[PDB]
Every structure is written in C-alpha cells, then in structure tokens.
Design a binder for this molecule. Sequence first.
Ligand SMILES: Nc1ncnc2c1ncn2[C@@H]1O[C@H](COP(=O)(O)CP(=O)(O)O)[C@@H](O)[C@H]1O
Ligand SMILES: [Mg+2]
Ligand SMILES: [Mg+2]
Length: 233
Amino acid sequence: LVPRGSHMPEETQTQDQPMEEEEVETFAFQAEIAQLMSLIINTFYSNKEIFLRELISNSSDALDKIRYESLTDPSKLDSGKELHINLIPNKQDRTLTIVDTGIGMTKADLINNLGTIAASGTKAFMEALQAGADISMIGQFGVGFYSAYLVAEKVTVITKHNDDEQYAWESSAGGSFTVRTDTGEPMGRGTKVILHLKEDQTEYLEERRIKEIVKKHSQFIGYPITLFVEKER
Ligand SMILES: Nc1ncnc2c1ncn2[C@@H]1O[C@H](COP(=O)(O)CP(=O)(O)O)[C@@H](O)[C@H]1O
Ligand SMILES: [Mg+2]
Ligand SMILES: [Mg+2]
C-alpha cells in the first residue's frame, strides 16, 4: 500500500529482547576476614606481586578437580574444553583478568567460600603480620584469595559450575560483598577473576612484568598458561 525501495537502519532495527531481572544479595564479611582485608589494603608491603601466585594456584586447584571429578562422574571426560589458564591485561580499562576452565563455583560456593566463613588461621596470620612476617606467607594460612587487594581496588568474580547458573561476586572491601545472577556473556564452565587495579599498580598490565612474576613464583601449574597481549596501535 505504501511502496518502499530502500529503508534506513533505524526503520529496520529489531525490537529489543525482553529485559532480564538479575537477583542481587548483599552479605557482610565475617569479622576477621573484614579485619584482614583492611590490613591488606592499607599497609605497605614490598612483595605485593605474590597476588598472582595465589590466584593461579586457585585456578590450578580448580583444574585438578576436573580430573578427579571424572572418577565419580565420567561425563566430564566428554567436554571438549581445554584445561588451561589465560591472563588478560587490558590497559584501556586498567584491569587484569585471570581466566580458567576449572570446576567453577555455585551461588552458595561464592557466599560460603569467598567471605562469610572464618578460616581457622586468619587470627594467627594477622598476628604474624603484626610481628613483621612477609605477605608471601598468606597462602599457608588459608586466606590467599584476599591477596588480590594488594593490587586491586575492586574485584569481580564471574563463575559457572555444572550444577548451577552463572553468577557474579563483587567487592570493593569496606565490609561487604554482593552476589548476583549473571545473565550477560555466558562464559562456559570455569571462573574469571577481574582485578580493577589501583593507580600505582599498573605495572601488572605490562607483558614483561607479568612474564617475570609467573616465572618467579608459578612454575608448577601443571596446565598451559597463556598471556594475551593487545597489539599496540
Ligand atoms: N579460580 C577458582 N575456581 C574455583 N574456586 C575458587 C577459585 N578461586 C577461589 N576459589 C574458591 O575460593 C576458596 C578460597 O580460596 P583461598 O585461596 O582464599 C584458600 P584455599 O582453599 O586455596 O587454601 C577456594 O577453596 C575455592 O573454593
Ligand atoms: Mg588458594
Ligand atoms: Mg599442583
């Protein structure tokens, strides 16, 4: 009835998909974890680079679990995904992302493993730090994840486990964290730790520095690790 030979982009733009709801919950850190985070954030240490060793060791542990979970559920053998770690610096956004294809975490694993439960060593570790211990000993005390806050002002964890949906955990410290269903880019099984780096900690975006600290502290991962470098324009 109204003849057309050619339409403008705005006229043929497709209608949006329906808006999704994401459920968000807010939790307090367990008291001694909150105290540890404030000690880590606000104290000078000379050897902050050990954060990456701690995150890589968490990913290697999650990857080891795929191998062993196949003994009680062989269907994991029929994933085609490679077991590996990727390190992804973004200079534009000032972020360093550690990506693995390990087992991932469920919603309740994020709440119970990343802030609301007390590790038995936390008070002894804070006393060892008062007495002048090197921050490197953190791993031995059961609280290595929080070493992220040596270099990051905010941390976001995106994760997907075979038994749950995809979730995002986030904290800028200050005593609480959030967990919220994540209906964005599906990441497939595994975990992605996004460090939003402090302004004076941008060395950890540079390829030589990252290679230096992987060779110094993370030579027995047991899985391939690759470093993605954005081409300089
Ligand atoms: N990349 C990852 N994949 C799966 N789970 C992870 C993870 N990073 C941290 N976690 C979970 O977070 C817990 C706490 O990590 P920490 O390094 O603080 C203590 P540890 O369990 O390694 O001795 C881990 O036990 C694990 O359940
Ligand atoms: Mg650990
Ligand atoms: Mg190992």
